[PDB]
Each structure stands twice: as C-alpha cells, then as structure tokens.
Design a protein around this nucleic acid. Structure first.
Ligand SMILES: Nc1ncnc2c1ncn2[C@@H]1O[C@H](COP(=O)(O)OP(=O)(O)OP(O)(O)=S)[C@@H](O)[C@H]1O
Ligand SMILES: Nc1ncnc2c1ncn2[C@@H]1O[C@H](COP(=O)(O)OP(=O)(O)OP(O)(O)=S)[C@@H](O)[C@H]1O
Ligand SMILES: Nc1ncnc2c1ncn2[C@@H]1O[C@H](COP(=O)(O)OP(=O)(O)O)[C@@H](O)[C@H]1O
Ligand SMILES: [Mg+2]
Ligand SMILES: [Mg+2]
Ligand SMILES: [Mg+2]
Ligand SMILES: [Zn+2]
Lengths: 637, 243, 97, 636
DNA sequence: AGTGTGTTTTTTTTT
DNA sequence: CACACACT
C-alpha cells in the first residue's frame, strides 16, 4: 500500500493544486445538507477532466491512463477522506454514515489516444481507462449488489460488516466469496442480518453500439457492455448516442477453465463516468442551453409582429416558397398546452397535421427538416416501419425470460414531436391502431398477457402521396387519397401539395437550387472532397457542455416551451367562437365536416401563436391568424 | 470450399479458422482467400472425433483484390498521373464509352450514361440540416433480348463495390435490409440486404417489372433519403444507402 | 432454402434446377404450371445460374442444363391459322428466350 | 473473522421503550391501555392477527416529547429497519406481554393439545406456535407537519422508479396498481418433528422456504445405544400460512417520459393473503425485503440482489349515508340530472344520456335483464370521449377495444412452464361495465365469440377443454360507427354499417347520432369549450352532478325489490309490439320478441331504479319513448 | 472422511 | 467460485 499511499498523497497534492474541485465538493456537501434538511441528492460523484491535473503531474496523469486500476482507487480514497474531513457535518444521517457513501471520480475531455470508438476498441489496450460514444440498444434493469453485508448478534455488541467486492466493483480482483451469514458468527452467535447499513448498488448491464454511418459498409455496429451501480443509474434510454468513459476489463477467466479451449475471452467495459450526447451531429443531448443574454434576445422581436414570419422564413431555408407551409410547420414545432380535467377525459395540446404532396415536393426533406429540427423527432415511412413494432411489441426477451413490452415508436413518440411519411403505404392495421390512439393520445397495450396502459401523447406530421401520382382536382381528395377520414379529421391541419409549375416560380426554384449547389460548404477547399468527419471533439462531458440562425432558433423555441404557457384569453375566445359560427356550418363544401375537433385544434393553434409572441396568455391576434391559416389550408389556397 | 471446384452434387463444406492480432480483420466475408495455415483439431465439447479447423500462419487473397481502400495509393503517383492524362485527353471519355459493353454494337450514348452513373454523383452536405443527394438510380425500360440484363451483369462485373442481384432472387421482405431471427437470440436481428451491400456501390438488379411492386415502393424512399430507415419490430435502426 | 431445426440454422434445400445443372433438364406440364414460377425459371435460365439472397443465404448456383419444356396448345389443339402467341397461353418473353 | 463497526442503535433500550409504549398506550391516548386490550383479543383469539400501528407510535413519541424523553427517536429507527423491530415485537409479545390466561370455549385447544404434551415426557414450544398472529405496520403520518413538514422524507409513497438500492433496508410505501395476484400457498414456517422410537417432538423453523430434512435425532436415548432416530413430518402440529406474491405496476403518469413501466413482487400472508385482487389500484406499505437467491445464481451473475418486498400495510385507492343519497337524488332527479351531469363535456344527445343510465343497472331476470345497448352513432363526434366515462366512475368499468389490436379472452394456460390458467381480454369484461372501442371495425371471429358470449352470458376458454364460465349478465356498449363516416339516410339503415344485421338485430336497442350544420349549436358547444378554458371545471349549467360513489349507491338501489311486471303493462307492451311489427311491414327492421323482452327489461330496470313496479305503465312509455327516439334517429 | 456436482404464447418473416 | 448428498 506504500505505492497506494503515495498515490493518495499525490492526489491530495492535486486537490491542493486545484481549489475549484474542493470548492465544488464543498458546494456539493452544502447542497446535500440543505436538501437533507428540506431531495434530489446528487451522489458523491466528482468530475475531474483528463486535461485537468495533466499539467502539474505528467507522471500521475499518464499513470491514470496506463494503470487506472491502480491510480483511481487511491485517488477516490483520498477524495473520500478529504470530503469527510471537509464536509464537517458528520452527525446527521448517522445510519447512512455506517453504510458509508463512496465518493466517485469522473472525467472530462477526450483521451483520443485512449478514447477512440467501440469498433476501434481492441484487447491491445485493456485495463486502461478509455471513452467511447455510441448508441445503446440493450439496457439491463437495475439489481442492487450487496457488497458490504451488515449482520450482528444482539449479545455481541459488535455489528459485523463483512464486505465483499467479488467481480464488478472491485479492481484488485478479490477472491469470490458467498456471504453466507454464518448463524454462529464466530463464538456461536446468532448474527442477525441487519437490513439497512448494508451497501446495495443497482447493477446495470448496458451495451453500447457504434454509429451505422461510422461503421463501414457491410459492417454491423460493434457492441460492448457497461456497468452502472447506484451511481450512474438510468439517465439514458435505449437507442441513444452516449459517450461513456470506461476501463477495458476482462472477466470469466477468459473461459480457459480446464479445456472449448479455443473459446473467446470474457471482456467488458466498466465505466466510471458517462457523458450522454444523443443530439444530432453531437449537439447538446437535445438539451438547449440558456443564458440571460439569449433570454433577453429574441423577445424584443417577439413584440414585433413580423417575428413569426421571420421564423417561418428561417425554416427550410433550402426550400423555396411554401411560406404558409413553413408557418404551419412552425406552429407544429411549438407545443400546445395539454389541458387536464378531473376525470379520465384529458384534453390534448398536441399538434397533428396531415399533408399530401406529389413525389419530390421536398416534403420528404421537409419531414427530414422537421426531424433535424425537433428534439425527439420520431420519423419513418409507410413501408419504413412495422405498425405493431413501432406501436408495441409484446414479445418476450430471452435474457429477461418473460414477456416484454417493446414500443418501437410509440413510447419514443410521447413527449416529443414525431413524423410519418407515405402513410398511404402504411399497413392498414397500423393505420387503424394509430386511429383514436392519436385522438386519445394514449394506448392501452392490453394486448396479450400484459395489460398496462401507457400514454402516447405527441405531435405528428403526416406526409402521404396521393393514390394517383399527383392530386387531381377532378378526382375527390378522398379519391386522391384512400386514407379514410377516420382520424384524418383528427389532424389539426390538413395540407395538399401540388407540384404545379409556373415560369416565375419555376425560375425561383431553379435559382434557389443553383445557389445551393455551386455553394461550397462552409470553409474547406473549393476543390476538396466531402469530409463529414467525426469532428475529433476533444470536449467531453462538462467540457462538451433579416435572418436568424437555426440552432439558436431551436434553443429559443425550446426555451419557449419551457417558459411560455399562454392561457385561452376572453377576447381570443370571442374571436374563436365568432369564427366557428360559420366555420362549422360553412356554405362552401370544403369537405371533412370540422365538428368539435377543429375547435380544439384552433384553440391549440392560437395558443402556440401566443407562444410565438411569448405572451403569458393568448391574444385575439393569435385566434384570427389561426383561423385565417386554417381557412387557407381548407380552401386549398 | 473453392467455388470454382464445383463438386457436383456436393454441398460446399466449410472449415473454421483462427487469426492472430496481425492476421485478424484483414479480409471480409464473401471474399476468396488462398490460405497457408496448419491443419488443426480440437474437441467440440461421436467417439474420438474432434472439430477440424485451421490455425493460420499466412493469409493471401484468392480474389487478390486489395483491402478496403484507405486512400493509400497502390497505383501510386504514376498510375494516377496517366489516369489524369486520360482525363486530360477528352477522347478517352469516348474510349471508356466504347470499351464498356463489349460486342454490344453501339448504343454509345447509353454507355455514356452508364459510365456517368457508375462514376458517382457527388453528395454535397449543406450547412443546413439538408444535404445534396449525390447518387442516382438509372431506369432500364425496353424490348427483351437486347443485352440489357447482359449489360447490367457486365457493369456489375466492372464495379464490384455493389452486387448484381435479381428481384425474385432477392427476398421481397427487407430488400434493402432483411430482419432475421438469430439462432442463439430469439430477437429478429437486422440482416444486411442488397442495398446495404449496394450502399457505397453502383448496383444492378434484374427483373424490376417481374418483381412485386409493393416492396419496390420501399426502395424509392431509401434511395431518395440515401439511407435506410427501419423502425420495424421495435428496432429503430437507420442504415445509409449510397447506391 | 430449408430451415433446419436439428442444426438450428437455415440450410440450403436442393433446387431441382441445380440438379438440372451439369445435365439435361426435363420439363413437363409447364404450360399449366404457376406463372410466378415461370418468371423465376426465366430469371434462372437467363444467366445459366440461379442467384438467391434470402434467410441469410446469399448464394448463387450455376445452372448449366439443356431444358425442354412440354406444353399443350390452347384446348390441346394448335390452330395453324391462329397466331402462335394466341395459340400459346403463356408469356411472350419466355418463347423469346 | 469479520470486521465489526459500532453503531448507536441502542436496541435493548428500544425494546424496553417499546414495552413501555405498549403498556402506556391507551384508547384514550389513541383518542384502559390499548395494547392489553390487544392482549385480551389475543387471549380469546378474536382476531387472527395483531398489527402494530405507527400512528400509535406517533402518539407515543409525542407523549415522550411532552415528557421530554428523546424516546430513542423510535420512529426513525423502526423506519430504517423494522424487520429486526418486528422480531423485537414478536419477542415482546412472547416475553414481556403475558401469556393470554383467559378461558376459551374451544377451537384453540387443538393446538394447545399439541402444546400440552410438551411438558409431559420431559424453546420446546416455538414462540410463533406459542401465540399466533400476523404483525404488520401501518404508517404514522402522511402529508402532515411531521418529518419537518418538508417534501417526502419517507412516508410518502413512491413508484418503482423512485425505489433505489439504498432503500432496501428501510420500510417503504408505494403507489400503483398490482398487475396480478398469485394464488394462496401454505408456508411451512416451523416444522414439528416426530421420531419413531423416541417420539420426541422438536421444532425447527425454516425461513429460507427451502427445507433441508434433518434425517437424524436429537433425542438423547436415540443418540445413545445407536438406535436410528429419524424425525418424521407431523404437519398437523406444524405451522402453516397462506402465501401470495403480487406484482404491482407503477402508475403510467408515475412512469418517466417514454419509459417502460416497472412492476415489483409483493408478498403477503395471514390477513392480507386472499384479500387482494389484481384489478385494484393500491397504496400499500411494507418493509423492503431483498430476496436471497436459491443458489449459484449469485455465482454466475454477481450479487444481483433481488427482492420479494412483503408489504405490512395495504390501502386500496378510492374505489355518506346510503339513504342520504336517496334524499338528494329525489331532489336531484338523477334520471335527467345524471344523463346531463354524466357527460357535461359532450353537451348533446340527452336522450342517449338517459338511455345510458338505464344501461348501467341493466336489470335482472329470474329466467336476462340485458339492455344490449348498441351506439352506432356518428363517427368523429362522440362515443370515444362519450365512451369510457362510465369506466372510471363504475367499478369493473372496462374501456375494451373491439379492434385496434389493443389486446379478446386470450386464455394463456401455458403462461408458465406449467399449464396454469390465465384470463384473456374478454373475461376481464364483466357485469360492471363493458365498453367496446372501435366496435365497427373488428375481428369477425372475435365478433362471433362476443356475440355468443353476450347471447349466452357464458365464456368458453376450451384449450384444456374446461368451460370456465365467469361471465354473467353484463352491460354492453357498442362503439360502432357508420362506414365511410357518412351514413346514408335514404337506404340501408342496417346495411350502411359494417356490423352484420344478425349482430345488429342481436342488440335490443340501437341509436344513431348525426352531426348537422343546420343550426348554431356549434356555438353553444363552443361556449362549453370556452367554459372548459378559463373555467377549467365544466361548462357551467344546472347539471347537478352525481359523484361516482354516490352513483355507486344509486346503482345499488337501482336493483330494488325485484319488481314483478304488471299485466296491464303486459297488454300495453304486447299492443306496442304488434304496432311495431305492423309498421315494420309498412320498416327495415321487423319487430322481434326479444326486442319486446329488451323493452320489458328497460321498463323493469327503470322501475327498480328509483320508482317501483306498481302499474309500471309510466316507465314503459318512458322506455318506449327512448326506443322510438332511437328508431327515428335511425330513420332521420 | 474423500471429492464430486448441481442452481441464471408472441412477431415478424418468411411466403 | 461452493454447499447437500453418496460413499470416500
Ligand atoms: N445490341 C446487341 N448487341 C449485342 N448482343 C446483343 C444485343 N442485343 C441483344 N444481344 C444479346 O442478346 C442477349 C439477350 O439479353 P440478356 O442478357 O438475356 O438480357 P436482356 O437483354 O435484358 O433480356 P430480357 O429482357 O431480360 S428477356 C444478350 O445477352 C446479348 O448476348
Ligand atoms: N360534443 C362534444 N363535446 C365536447 N367535445 C367534443 C364533442 N364532440 C367531439 N369532441 C371532441 O372530440 C373528441 C370526441 O370524439 P371521440 O368520441 O373521442 O371520437 P369519435 O367521435 O368516436 O371518433 P371516430 O373514431 O371517428 S367514431 C374529444 O377530443 C372531444 O374534445
Ligand atoms: N420548392 C422546392 N425548393 C427546393 N427544393 C425542392 C422544392 N420542391 C422540391 N424540392 C426538391 O425535391 C427533392 C425531393 O423532395 P422530397 O422531399 O423527396 O419530396 P416530397 O415532398 O414528395 O416528399 C429534393 O431534392 C428537394 O430539395
Ligand atoms: Mg417522399
Ligand atoms: Mg432481364
Ligand atoms: Mg370510442
Ligand atoms: Zn428419536
């Protein structure tokens, strides 16, 4: 332990070098204490970048990489003793004091030399801490691990704590032991096992896969499991891009028990710290940041009436025209209020729009633009997905051993904007399933043995081609699209895209494409091949942390969903009802009797229009704008 | 076993091998290799019979094709210099035109279109979320017995970055990528279909008309997006389709 | 291709046209049999090889076989005044190949 | 051999404080001591269990604070680990709370007979065998000033997601609905050993639920002279207890955004066993109890500590004089009141609203009181929001879906390696409420199965061949809507709808809703919605609502006195049926005797609802007015 | 007393 | 890995 003690001393010298860390720990402890007096207790997790401490000690920083299993254990021991000597509030929660709260070490930045990828991970670099960012398909459920056993015979007055770290949490590979709890203890003592004071760490077997696009053609994504034990439990859902900082470790004796003997070795990545980054193009994990500077920004424009049109223009800058369509998709993006009632009847604030368009009307790209604009962005085509699979798969999983719920899109759909393309081609069973589950925004999932009902409230855009190649006015719209009005009425907006062509507009489209094409991508050599590289992003973890820019716009609108919650206002109410007067009984045969749905649709549309204005309540301007756009869409103009 | 050997009426036997750290991952499946390794035997777990396999001491490519081109110029500066010279001489364009489809007797503009398609349209990635679609898919309509399938086969032989197939020969479900149940996992895994293989390659397929239309609809979307988006069976994997 | 429960994987099942390969191929009752099967035969014969990619089996088998189709005229009697295509209940492309 | 860390539990003082509390806790303190009252309950064995109440401990702590004694902070310690405290209570009721010492008539001496032989032929009698009970724990406070009056800090029930490994030691409370309930199974806690030559009766108690046979004898004379003493199973002397384990699903809203709901096992015994049903949403309380594995599971998968999580207390969620309801509904006139107040959001189809009220009670017939409501209605206007309202308010209310692949009586006998019966989707539907969703489009085989079930009030699972008939008369509601969304008034009143005529004719009553742009009622419904906005309660009218519990009592008295129909009613209904048949000859649907039977069922159901049989005539014009309004709605 | 040995229907996918 | 059987 002389080298162990030396590493403890060097880590202490580190803590001395960087006050901010001990300050952060101090802030953590006071956060723990006050919240304890009051919840949401953050764990004893401490985050120190690789680029940190790299300066004062090259040797220690290197040996962390070379032999993490010998560097981090003493480092965390020193972390813990420093914290408990510096928290200075030992008395409260004396029960948990004996159970002990380990202090955990995390990291920031990219190793590069160590941190490359799951596929690039090879045995040549093993027992060394690395980091990889990947998609996780499989997540194992949590199971506590009892490493410190609390057991005691009343007569002894000793309270034996037999602590066992067999395979996972241990780094020294301590010998396996069963923790029998001998009922004789040592001196024939009953040795009652005292529940509580006993450490339990909820274990996770989480396997992470590489990018399909980073994987070369014909190569399946490379998958490797990671372990999380009541320290990093459950930030991430399956199928999310996530960066994990883990050490490459082997277990199972490599399978070389006695003889077959050519079987592979059992290895696995145990990850101390994890940085989830599932945002597209390595963004902010779909979590838009916020600053008071950005807060005060935009707002002054929101007072100006033209801001809504400016936002509409900003959308799909690669597309020409479709300004009303862009306004509609903007209204889509902003989320309406889910009105709740003291019964099973809960009003939906979700926005659902159906659109029919000729092939190559950019609507597919439009759906793609909505995708890359939305946070969740659950999108597919009519042939793209299996309806049951996307809604719910009630098949069992072999590792689980019993019947499992597997909602491909539905559970992914709820609490996020979702998309669907070519719904005419979609399986009719899926169509009738989505029918009335998107109206009620909830699915009973009572199919098969499992009957648990799970909510599915989300905003959906539909882009299905006409039955004929192009919409023919001579044919009825329902002749042009075979999709029944069932839940087709339950689309808050309906859109028809016809690729009719006029010299002025044709020139406009052509010039737009000409500008988009000759334009060399930002920077780069004019004669330079496309790179679309990995960006070699060193920043990992907290290191990663009139026209308007798009991601900035997305951050603003997300901030809006967070903040702006308008309520239906009386003058807006009167405008709405005055419209509805003739809207429900319009003499013109616009087809699709609007009924009671469209009243709620326009309510939501005016609410989101107020959200554009950032007003804490709706305004009649929102109501009349929504009515104007709705009549625009319904007339087909 | 030696696809050229064609043992008549014998199912092709297969043997297991092992590779070392400086031998592993050298070559991909579906590629022929001339191997030099010791004959090897181990017990699988039938009396005194043990698993036959090979421990390899040297790997050589029977197909002889180089590995995944990592831009390392085995053609070196010289061969690419004459390549540019051929590009410098505009007549060589018609040279490539005529050379394609031997014995076709003409159809030169058709061959020019084929050369242009195989040449690969440039995929431009806009600073916007959008991205200009590079590849295109050429449609072959006409009278039968006109070397059309012959020309397709020739073109695929010219460029093996993709694989020649046929509509009926390709599984209707998951043409781009089929979903199959793994023997040791009851979950239906994603098996790479033709356009997974065709991704990154110019692909020729036969009997488009004879193929059932409904799944061919699923092909146009995949080529349009240049990817393959699947959410079937609760699996939301999306794979690129650059073909 | 045949799913093999004993081995637990999909296995190749002997295509009779592969059995035809390397030898003569007899064909009978063909004018009455299934049309999709006829198109499959067209595909197979065009390249003298059968290419199959399904169930994880992407194999392609050479089919070198001299084939002889047996057919009955429409109603069993060919009408010489009638055009052959009208005397034939089958496709034009097959008679071309 | 094992390191030991010292903790300030002060367990013995906890035990003596517990004894002092039990002595000192009164009903007056709750308002003689309550716990010697519990002792005399034990003595005569009036109950089968004695259950510790935390509320009593709360009052004790309050008293000790008044006394100024710290009281060891008993509540916090028992919350942290009560299983050891449970053993302390067992010791106390064995050690310090006295022997019952009360004369009993009978039915307990049989074990006391086993108890009596212990002294002759001579700890020897297990404390659990000594006194028999099931000691549970019932929380002391919730949403009160306790726990510093701050958020959570125990007490507050949490879903499975909020449960953590650190929570294994401490007692917990949980929200949600139990997915399923296991059957009862005897649990052999302590086994009574009987040897052949010696006859000695030694008792060992197994807590691992896995029993290892002793195969030897501890009797001294069997040990000497090497006579083989084998202790055999004397079950009747040994203790048993019914065991039930139940998986509880966390609430959907409790589940995080886009997360798969998690269910955990809950194990019960004694009082609570057999007293639970899966369909209920239960807020139950219990210590957290991790489950030791059978063996070698830990070797392959690490510790992997799982739990069985026995619950000490159970509280099913909400599911007031009975006659007091009658006084209000007489003032309320619940017929009209319920019809409107039941769906204030709908604002329309008031005749349909009246009809649905009668569907709830349904009626009962000696020879069978089935309304057979079919709501073909209008698509995209109602019958989904209109639907499922009765599901929550009425128990056994099921919002079933005819199609949509939402689930139909899919029995799963092969649910486990062993063939154990498992109910399907339709068997869940029962007499309370059966709401069909997406009825118009649905599986034809399911259509035939449901038609046979409803016409027979029986369910046939087959498979093993057994006819497990659990269904009885049940109220049925149809979500069918006209095909294409636009019914044809001119032709095909029955054929414009996907449902077959035989299926249509099977229902006793059928109604049609139709949306028309003729009037400005759009604006009135708009006023209702613009109530629902900035008045997030209801469209304010004279609806006079009936609370579902009050509605439950209204249903309870809706089946009253079994009103025998008057023969004047009999003549009136036969004349009405004759007129209906004659008009049918004149249209699309000929009058059927079963239709007249359904009319009679309507009349008697309304009669026993609030009124009575008597001449019963007036109720018959009420029901037949409903019928003719339905017929006109079909005709329009 | 040697020493050995055992426990973790559905749903697409064909067609 | 490690604990009940069947002799060792
Ligand atoms: N212009 C041509 N020059 C040379 N050979 C030709 C020409 N047209 C047809 N052929 C020959 O005719 C054969 C018939 O074509 P195939 O390779 O069978 O495929 P294909 O032309 O697509 O016919 P289908 O449409 O599939 S029946 C070719 O293989 C050539 O050998
Ligand atoms: N009369 C009404 N009063 C209040 N809300 C109404 C009314 N009619 C329709 N709605 C609204 O529209 C929905 C009610 O229609 P539902 O009963 O859910 O559907 P449906 O009419 O059965 O539709 P299908 O599937 O086309 S038969 C809810 O979201 C209500 O808010
Ligand atoms: N108005 C437009 N401006 C720019 N590009 C357009 C426009 N309309 C169509 N396109 C182009 O059409 C192509 C195909 O569009 P796509 O999204 O597949 O069409 P659809 O609307 O039928 O789904 C894309 O390259 C897209 O940029
Ligand atoms: Mg499209
Ligand atoms: Mg061809
Ligand atoms: Mg409904
Ligand atoms: Zn004995």
């Amino acid at each position: 332990d002389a080298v162990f003690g030396d590493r403890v001393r060097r880590f202490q010298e580190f803590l001395d070098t960087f006050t901010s860390y001990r300050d952060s720990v101090r802030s953590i402890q006071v956060y723990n204490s006050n919240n304890a007096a009051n919840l949401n207790i953050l764990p004893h997790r401490i985050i120190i970048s690789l680029d940190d401490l790299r300066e004062f000690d090259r040797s220690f920083w290197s040996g962390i990489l070379v032999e993490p299993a010998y560097f981090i254990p003493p480092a965390e021991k020193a972390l813990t003793d420093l914290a408990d000597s510096m928290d200075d509030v030992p008395h409260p929660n004396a029960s948990a004091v004996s159970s002990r709260h380990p202090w955990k070490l995390s990291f920031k930045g990219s190793f590069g030399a160590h941190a490359l990828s799951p596929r690039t991970l090879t045995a040549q670099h093993l027992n060394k801490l690395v980091s990889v960012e990947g998609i996780v398909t499989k997540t194992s459920l949590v199971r506590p691990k009892l490493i410190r056993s609390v057991h005691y015979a009343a007569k002894t007055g000793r309270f034996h704590y037999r602590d066992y770290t067999d395979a996972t949490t241990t780094l020294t590979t301590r010998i396996p032991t069963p923790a029998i709890y001998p009922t004789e203890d040592t001196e024939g003592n009953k040795l009652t096992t005292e529940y509580g004071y006993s450490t339990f760490i909820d274990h996770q077997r989480i396997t992470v896969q590489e990018m399909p696009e980073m994987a070369p053609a014909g190569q399946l994504p490379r998958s490797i499991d990671v372990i999380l034990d009541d320290d990093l439990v459950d930030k991430t859902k399956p199928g999310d891009r996530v960066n994990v900082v883990g050490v490459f470790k082997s277990l199972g004796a490599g399978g070389m028990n006695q003889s077959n003997t050519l079987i592979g070795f059992k290895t696995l990545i145990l990850g101390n710290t994890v940085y989830p980054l599932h945002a597209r193009s390595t963004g902010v994990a779909a979590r838009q940041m916020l600053t008071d500077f950005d807060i005060r920004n935009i707002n002054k424009l929101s007072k100006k009436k033209d801001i809504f049109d400016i936002l509409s223009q900003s959308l799909a800058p690669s597309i020409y025209g479709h300004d009303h369509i862009k306004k509609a998709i903007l209204l889509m993006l902003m989320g309406g209020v889910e009105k709740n009632l003291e019964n099973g009847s809960h009003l939906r604030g979700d926005i659902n729009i159906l659109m029919v368009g000729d092939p190559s009307t950019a609507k597919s790209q439009l759906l793609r633009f909505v995708l890359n604009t939305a946070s969740l962005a659950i999108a597919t085509t009519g042939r793209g997905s299996s309806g049951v699979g996307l809604t719910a798969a009630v098949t069992t999983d072999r590792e689980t051993g019993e019947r499992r719920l597997e909602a491909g899109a539905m559970v992914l759909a709820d609490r996020g904007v979702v998309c669907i393309d070519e719904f005419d081609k979609m399986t009719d069973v899926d169509r009738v399933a989505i029918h009335e589950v998107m109206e009620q925004q909830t699915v009973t999932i009572a199919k098969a043995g499992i009957h648990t009902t799970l909510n599915a409230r989300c905003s959906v855009i539909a882009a299905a081609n006409p039955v004929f190649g192009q919409y023919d006015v001579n044919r009825d719209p329902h002749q042009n699209i075979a999709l029944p009005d069932s839940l087709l009425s339950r689309f808050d907006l309906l859109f028809v895209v016809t690729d009719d062509i006029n010299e002025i507009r044709d020139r406009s489209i052509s010039e737009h494409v000409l500008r988009t094409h000759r334009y060399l991508p930002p920077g780069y050599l004019e004669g330079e091949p496309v790179r679309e590289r990995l960006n070699l992003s060193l920043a990992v973890g907290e290191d990663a942390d009139k026209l308007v820019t798009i991601p900035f716009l997305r951050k603003y609108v997300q901030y809006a969903k967070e903040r702006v919650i308008p309520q239906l206002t009386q003058e807006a109410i009167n405008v709405i009802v005055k419209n509805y007067t003739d809207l429900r009984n319009d003499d013109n045969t616009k087809k699709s009797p609007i009924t009671a749905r469209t009243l709620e649709t326009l309510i939501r549309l005016a609410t989101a229009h107020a959200k554009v204005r950032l007003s804490k309540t709706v305004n009649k301007v929102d109501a009349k704008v929504a009515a104007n756009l709705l009549r625009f869409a319904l007339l087909g103009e | 076993e030696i696809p050229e050997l064609v043992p008549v009426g014998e199912m092709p036997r297969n043997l297991t091998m092992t590779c070392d750290r400086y031998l592993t991952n050298k070559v991909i499946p579906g590629t022929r290799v001339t191997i030099v390794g010791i004959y090897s035997i181990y017990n699988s777990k039938g009396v005194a019979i043990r698993t036959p396999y090979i421990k390899i001491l040297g790997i050589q490519s029977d197909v002889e094709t180089s590995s995944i081109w990592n831009s390392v110029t085995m053609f070196t500066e010289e061969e690419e210099e004459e390549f540019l010279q051929l590009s410098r001489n505009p007549k060589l364009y018609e040279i490539l035109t005529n050379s394609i489809a031997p014995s076709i007797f003409g159809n030169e503009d058709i061959k020019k279109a084929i050369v242009c398609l195989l040449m690969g349209g440039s995929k431009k990635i806009l600073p916007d979320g959008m991205r200009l679609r590079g590849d295109i898919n050429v449609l072959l309509l006409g009278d039968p017995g006109t070397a059309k399938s012959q020309l397709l086969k020739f073109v695929e032989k010219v460029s093996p970055i993709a694989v020649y197939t046929s509509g009926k020969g390709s599984s209707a479900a998951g043409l781009t990528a089929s979903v199959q149940r793994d023997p040791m996992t009851r979950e239906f895994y994603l098996e790479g279909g033709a356009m997974v293989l065709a991704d990154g390659g110019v692909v020729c397929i036969d009997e488009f008309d004879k193929m059932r239309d409904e799944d061919r609809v699923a092909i146009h979307e995949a080529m349009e997006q240049q990817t393959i988006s699947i959410a079937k069976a609760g699996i939301t994997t999306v794979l690129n389709s650059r073909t | 291709v045949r799913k093999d429960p004993i081995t637990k994987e999909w296995t190749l099942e002997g295509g009779a046209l592969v059995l035809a390969d390397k030898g003569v191929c007899l064909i009978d009752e063909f004018d009455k049999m299934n049309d999709q099967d006829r198109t499959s035969i067209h595909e197979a014969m065009e390249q003298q090889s059968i290419s199959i990619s399904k169930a994880g089996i992407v194999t392609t088998l050479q089919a070198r076989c001299s084939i002889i189709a047996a057919a009955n005229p429409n109603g069993g009697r060919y009408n010489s005044t009638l055009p052959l295509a009208q005397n034939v209940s089958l496709t034009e492309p097959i008679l071309s190949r | 051999a094992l390191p030991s860390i010292q903790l300030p539990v002060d367990y013995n003082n906890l035990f003596n404080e517990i004894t002092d509390f039990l002595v000192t806790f009164k009903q007056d303190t709750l308002s003689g001591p309550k716990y010697m009252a519990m002792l005399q309950k034990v003595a005569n064995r009036e109950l089968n269990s004695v259950i510790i109440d935390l509320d009593d401990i709360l009052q004790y702590q309050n008293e000790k604070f008044l006394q100024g004694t710290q009281a060891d902070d008993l509540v916090s310690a028992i919350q942290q680990n009560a299983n050891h405290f449970t053993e302390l209570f067992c010791r106390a009721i064995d050690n310090n709370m006295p022997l019952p010492t009360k004369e009993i008539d009978y039915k307990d001496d049989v074990l006391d007979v086993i108890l009596n032989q212990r002294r002759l032929r001579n700890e020897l009698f297990p404390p659990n065998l000594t006194r028999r009970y099931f000691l549970y724990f019932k929380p002391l406070s919730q949403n009160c000033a306790r726990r510093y009056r701050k958020k959570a800090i125990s007490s507050k029930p949490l879903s499975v997601r909020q449960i953590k490994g650190d929570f294994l030691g401490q007692l917990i409370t949980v929200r949600g609905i139990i997915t399923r309930v296991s059957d009862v199974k005897p649990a052999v806690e302590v086994i009574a050993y009987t040897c052949d030559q010696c006859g000695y009766e030694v008792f060992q108690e197994v807590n691992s639920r896995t029993f290892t046979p002793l195969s030897e004898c501890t009797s001294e004379e069997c040990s000497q002279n090497q006579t083989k003493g084998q202790l055999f199973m004397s079950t009747r002397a040994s203790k048993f207890s019914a065991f039930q384990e139940c998986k509880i699903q966390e609430l959907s809203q409790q589940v995080p955004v886009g997360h798969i709901p998690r269910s955990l096992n809950i194990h019960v015994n004694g009082t609570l066993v057999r007293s639970l049903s899966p369909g209920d949403i239960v807020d139950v309380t219990g210590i957290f109890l991790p489950a030791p594995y059978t063996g070698f599971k830990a070797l392959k998968a690490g510790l992997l500590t799982e739990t069985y999580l026995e619950a000490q207390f159970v509280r099913q969620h909400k599911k007031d004089v009975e006659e007091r309801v009658m006084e209000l509904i007489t003032s309320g006139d619940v017929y009209n009141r319920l019809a409107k107040s039941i769906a204030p959001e709908i604002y329309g189809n008031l005749d349909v609203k009246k009809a649905l009220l009668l569907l709830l009670v349904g009626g009962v017939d000696k020879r069978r009181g089935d309304i057979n409501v079919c709501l073909m209605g209008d698509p995209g206007v109602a019958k989904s929001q209109l639907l499922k309202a009765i599901c929550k308010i009425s128990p056994r209310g099921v919002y079933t879906t005819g199609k949509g692949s939402s689930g139909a009586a899919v029995m799963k006998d092969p649910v486990t390696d062993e063939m154990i019966l498992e109910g399907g989707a339709l068997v869940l539907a029962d007499n309370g409420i059966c709401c069909i969703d997406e009825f118009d489009k649905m599986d034809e085989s399911d259509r035939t199965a449901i038609h046979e079930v409803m016409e027979q009030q029986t369910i046939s699972i087959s498979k093993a061949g057994i006819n497990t008939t659990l269904n009885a008369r049940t109220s049925i509601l149809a979500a069918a809507n006209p095909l294409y969304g636009r019914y044809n008034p001119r032709l095909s009143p029955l054929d414009n709808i996907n449902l077959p005529a035989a299926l249509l004719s099977r229902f006793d009553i059928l109604f049609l809703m139709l949306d028309i742009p003729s009037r400005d009622d759009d604006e009135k419904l708009a006023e209702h919605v613009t109530y629902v906005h900035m008045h997030n309660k209801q469209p304010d009218l004279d609806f006079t609502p009936v609370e579902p519990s009050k509605m439950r009592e209204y249903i309870a008295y809706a089946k009253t006195k079994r009103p025998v129909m008057s023969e004047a009613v009999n003549d009136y209904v036969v004349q009405a049926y004759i007129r209906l048949r004659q008009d049918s000859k004149r249209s699309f649907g000929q009058a059927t005797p079963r239709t007249l039977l359904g009319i009679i069922r309507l009349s008697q159901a309304l009669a026993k609802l609030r009124l009575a049989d008597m001449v019963d005539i007036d109720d018959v014009e009420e029901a037949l007015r409903l019928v003719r309004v339905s017929k006109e709605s079909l005709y329009q």
